[PDB]
Amino acid sequence: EVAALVVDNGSGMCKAGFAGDDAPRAVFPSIVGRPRKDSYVGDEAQSKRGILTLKYPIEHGIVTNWDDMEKIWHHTFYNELRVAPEEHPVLLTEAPLNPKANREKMTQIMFETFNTPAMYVAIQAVLSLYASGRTTGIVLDSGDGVSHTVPIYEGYALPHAILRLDLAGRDLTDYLMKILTERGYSFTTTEEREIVRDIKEKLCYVALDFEQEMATAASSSSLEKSYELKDGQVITIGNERFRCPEALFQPSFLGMEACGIHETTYNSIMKCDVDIRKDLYANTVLSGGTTMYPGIADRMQKEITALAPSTMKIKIIAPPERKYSVWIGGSILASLSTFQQMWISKQEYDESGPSIVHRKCF
């Protein structure tokens, strides 16, 4: 048969490729822009922020604007991948607990706007579990605009226990800007957010112990690293390195009341049947770009261990490529001989309409 396409749309980044590959073929920004061609998507839209009025179709993980998304998909198919959708089964990914209505429009749009011969909508968190080699376990997926702790058992996500923490890599990028500014630098523009995001990605890490790290940085220079601007200037970053991602465990640094990611994972586990919690503790999988900070795994271990019973075996799984675990899970799933029957065919759609996405998905 032909090649299945795996499209993973995020709040900040869109990843797309072909099932069978172990990495997406294309990855671009999830922003669209129209004058203030006729529309612009990705980097090209970002380089005209001035002349175009930009939009962000995916917000906190949920498609907020459809014609915007329809355009991102058009971009994916014809520009990035260069394939005719009507010639490839497409596998989409959606955020946990995304409304039943969005699920139907995704289906409807794929069959009536792009003429896909088949398609399927899968839950992101679950695709990551599949990618780690498990069917049972709790996932902490943290992207650029939203975090979710998702308990899964025997391949099914547990809807009543899924939690949402609106604190991801974006908040972290702005926070790093704020603290480097207070430090004496000045990072406030959109072009600079782009620079600080890179800083955050190459120099930041999670301290095993906040205070001790802070104490070493106040009395020593050992934790400092240098970063060079395209313009040539070298700037140093010390405690901002760990102080930035610490906001994941302590949202109050950002004036947020929500509890940390470690505590949110623990709260999701407890909303579960006491008979499967051990399976979750021993199978806590880290997913998403925000979970890439050096030292986050050891930290999560220590924080969970302290929140859970002393007789509890805790194990944090952090795949080296978790930045794309979601997409790889879709590449892995759409390849399975047993998943071929899950696809929603054009035929199945015509006869049963959009409401069939609940019957074949989920």
Residues found near ligand ATP in the complex (CB under 6 A): 10-13, 61, 143-146, 168-170, 197, 200-201, 288-290, 292-293, 323
Within 10 A of 348 (CB to CB), how many other CB atoms are there? 15
197-203's contacts with Cβ under 8 Å and 24+ in sequence apart are 197/169, 197/173, 199/227, 199/237, 200/169, 200/172, 200/173, 200/176, 200/244, 201/292, 202/227, 203/227, 203/237, 203/241
Tell me whether residue 192 or residue 201 sits nearer to ligand ATP (CB atom).
201
Tell me whether residue 57 or residue 354 sits nearer to ligand ATP (CB atom).
57
Angle at 216 (CA atoms; ends 227, 218), nearest 5 degrees: 75
Residue 13 binds which one of Ca ion, ligand ATP, none, with CB within 5 to 8 A depending on kind?
ligand ATP
Tell me whether residue 89 or residue 96 sits nearer to ligand ATP (CB atom).
96
User: What does the binding site for Ca ion look like in residue numbers (CB under 5 A)?
Assistant: 10, 143, 252
Q: How far is the CB of 309 from ligand ATP (least distance, A)?
A: 31
Within 10 A of 320 (CB to CB), how many other CB atoms are there? 7
Q: How far is the CB of 36 from ligand ATP (least distance, A)?
A: 25
Question: In whole angstroms, what is the distance from residue 150 CA to residue 129 CA?
Answer: 10
Residue 284 binds which one of Ca ion, ligand ATP, none, with CB within 5 to 8 A depending on kind?
none
Q: How far is the CB of 329 from Ca ion (least distance, A)?
A: 11
Q: How far is the CB of 215 from ligand ATP (least distance, A)?
A: 24
Tell me whether residue 6 or residue 344 sits nearer to ligand ATP (CB atom).
6
Q: How far is the CB of 198 from ligand ATP (least distance, A)?
A: 8
Tell me whether residue 203 or residue 326 sits nearer to Ca ion (CB atom).
326
Tell me whether residue 7 or residue 13 sits nearer to ligand ATP (CB atom).
13
Residue 252 binds which one of Ca ion, ligand ATP, none, with CB within 5 to 8 A depending on kind?
Ca ion
CA 315 vs CA 285, 290, 294: distances in Å: 9, 19, 17
What phi and psi, each to the nearest 5 degrees, are found at residue 201?
-75, -25
- For residue 97, give the DSSP letter: T
Asked if 222 and 216 touch (Cβ cutoff 8 Å), the reply is: yes
Tell me the helices (H) and strands (E) count for the chain, helix number first: 14, 19
Q: How far is the CB of 323 from ligand ATP (least distance, A)?
A: 5
Residue 146 binds which one of ligand ATP, Ca ion, none, with CB within 5 to 8 A depending on kind?
ligand ATP
- Largest Cα–Cα separation, the chain: 71
Tell me whether residue 238 or residue 288 sits nearer to ligand ATP (CB atom).
288
Q: How far is the CB of 286 from ligand ATP (least distance, A)?
A: 11
Residue 42 binds which one of ligand ATP, Ca ion, none, with CB within 5 to 8 A depending on kind?
none
Bridge partners, 151 (sequence order): 138
Residue 94 binds which one of ligand ATP, Ca ion, none, with CB within 5 to 8 A depending on kind?
none
Q: How far is CA 94 from the centre of its chain?
A: 10
Nearest to 11 by CA among 133, 147, 163, 114: 147
Tell me whether residue 88 or residue 197 sits nearer to ligand ATP (CB atom).
197
Tell me whether residue 264 or residue 290 sits nearer to ligand ATP (CB atom).
290
Residue 96 binds which one of ligand ATP, Ca ion, none, with CB within 5 to 8 A depending on kind?
none
Q: Which helix (H) or strand (E) holds 306?
A: helix 296-307
Residue 16 binds which one of Ca ion, ligand ATP, none, with CB within 5 to 8 A depending on kind?
none
Q: How far is the CB of 139 from Ca ion (least distance, A)?
A: 12
Question: In whole angstroms, what is the distance from residue 178 CA to residue 246 CA?
Answer: 14
Q: How far is the CB of 202 from ligand ATP (least distance, A)?
A: 7
Residue 260 binds which one of ligand ATP, Ca ion, none, with CB within 5 to 8 A depending on kind?
none
Question: In whole angstroms, what is the distance from residue 196 CA to residue 113 CA?
Answer: 38
Asked if 224 and 237 touch (Cβ cutoff 8 Å), the reply is: yes
